Amino acid sequence: QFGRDIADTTDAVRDPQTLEILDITPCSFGGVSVITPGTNTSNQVAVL
Amino acid sequence: PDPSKPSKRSAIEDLLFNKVTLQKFNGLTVLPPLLTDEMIAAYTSALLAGTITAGWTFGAGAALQIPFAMQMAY
Numbered sequence A: 001q002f003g004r005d006i007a008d009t010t011d012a013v014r015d016p017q018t019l020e021i022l023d024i025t026p027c028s029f030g031g032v033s034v035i036t037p038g039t040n041t042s043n044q045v046a047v048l
Numbered sequence B: 001p002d003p004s005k006p007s008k009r010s011a012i013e014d015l016l017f018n019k020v021t022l023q024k025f026n027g028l029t030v031l032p033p034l035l036t037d038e039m040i041a042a043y044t045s046a047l048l049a050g051t052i053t054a055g056w057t058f059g060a061g062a063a064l065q066i067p068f069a070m071q072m073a074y
């Protein structure tokens, strides 16, 4: 019915009607970082 | 390093990199290193060239090639 990875987590699922398998990729995450200069000179920042 | 690119690494460096043979977990993430390995290879090549050319005048002004046999004799 479905597959799993080396970490024993769901990795692919087949559709019962159209018997073809579908991949699963978790929704993107990650931390944010704020690049700033000294407040002595400006208040303009860039983010990554 | 060989100018016939891609040859930024020497033969031995390529052999080592091949010998070494060089997410989903929700919370776990791997950040990239600040210095790419191209920069590390460039640093190593610069050090090697400096120590092979300048001899005992590596770091100062110099800017001339000391003969290798002289360094070997020293």
Ligand SMILES: *[C@@H]1O[C@H](CO)[C@@H](O)[C@H](O)[C@H]1NC(C)=O
Pocket: A040
């Ligand atoms: C920057 O500002 C802070 C306070 O806003 C002050 O303590 C510091 O001395 C200043 N430094 C410079 C280089 O202007």
